[PDB]
Structure formats: C-alpha cells, structure tokens
Amino acid sequence: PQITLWKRPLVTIRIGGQLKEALLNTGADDTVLEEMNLPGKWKPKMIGGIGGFIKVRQYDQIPVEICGHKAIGTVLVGPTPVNIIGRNLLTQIGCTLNF
Amino acid sequence: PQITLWKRPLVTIRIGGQLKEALLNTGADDTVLEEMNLPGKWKPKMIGGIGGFIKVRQYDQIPVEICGHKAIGTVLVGPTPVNIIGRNLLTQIGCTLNF
C-alpha cells in the first residue's frame, strides 16, 4: 500500500484476537500498545518521548498482523495516548519512506 | 530517495544558514526543533507526546530544505529530545509510507 500523510497514518492491527487501530510511527524505535493483558513473562522498562518517560511492560515474540502482513516481535504495553507501531515491526513488513 | 527503517530515519536539513540533523517522523503532526533562535514573531504553544506536554515557540512560514527538497511552513522550537520533521512538512516534499 502507499499511505499519504495528510492525516495521521492509522491502520488496523490484529493481536491476540483483538483488532485495534494503530499509528505507523517512523519516529518510534519500539511498538507501544495501550493497556492490554498479554500472556507470558515480561520485564519493566522505561521509554522516553517528547514530554518525558513512562514505565511499560515488555513482551517478546508476540505475533502481530498489520494490514494483512504478518510480523513477530517485541511489544511494549503501557499508558500511551495512542497505539504505536514502531520500526521494529515496520521493518518486518518491508515498510519504507519515499520522496 | 527511498529510506528503510532498520535505523532511525535521520536526514540533514538546512534552516537559516544552519545545518542540523532531524528525524522523518510520521508519528508527529508538527515539526519540532531543539532550542535555537529564528527570525520573526513567535507565539507560545503547547504540544504533547508520551510523557506529557511541553511548551514550545511557534514560528510560521519558515523555509526548510529537507534532504534537498524545499518546504515553507510552521516550525516549533523547544525542549524536544530529538529534532523531528513532522507531517506538516513531510506532505510538502511529497513523502509517503510504502510496503
């Protein structure tokens, strides 16, 4: 697909049987999802952004489907204002920036 | 050009006779640069991200050359962790996400 940037690049992603709306964010190293209960072990982590840092839960090897494309990787869960798909997952689906 | 995301998408920008490094960020509505002086009248604005909100100074109609392409628009200045080129200017240089 080719996605223009006139509006926020929100797409549908599938995780654990739940379909959510997420922002394709080239400005995020990691993928951060709104509070959700994922099974498996996790580790505490601090991630920073424009207004400071927030504490999140890091889960590994989580299957995620982004617009029909299948990916598997790390997912951080915490109090983020919006669901965010980062570069760790975007690279897996061959996503690039073009101009 | 085509930029992959295995590494942060940093590019050189030229603004006011100054060269700086910025990140092409599809997750930001606006363009925010670290503290610096710019010509013209500026007004206080507040923006938010993960971690909360910060105060910035808004400068309108500022010429910005991004990796060779010209844009003229709004540039915010403040305590951002990294210089970021947001969608307001990405659209001007015809940038899109592809996969």
């Binding site: 995020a28 991630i47 840092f53 | 509505d29 606006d30 938010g48 991200g49 990294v82």
Partner: peptide, 9 residues
C-alpha cells in the same frame, strides 16, 4: 534508551 516520538498539538 529508546525513543517513541509521537506528537500532537
């Protein structure tokens, strides 16, 4: 430390 730079006015 990783950065997640989502931003909105």
């Amino acid at each position: 430390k990783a950065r997640v730079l989502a931003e909105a006015m």
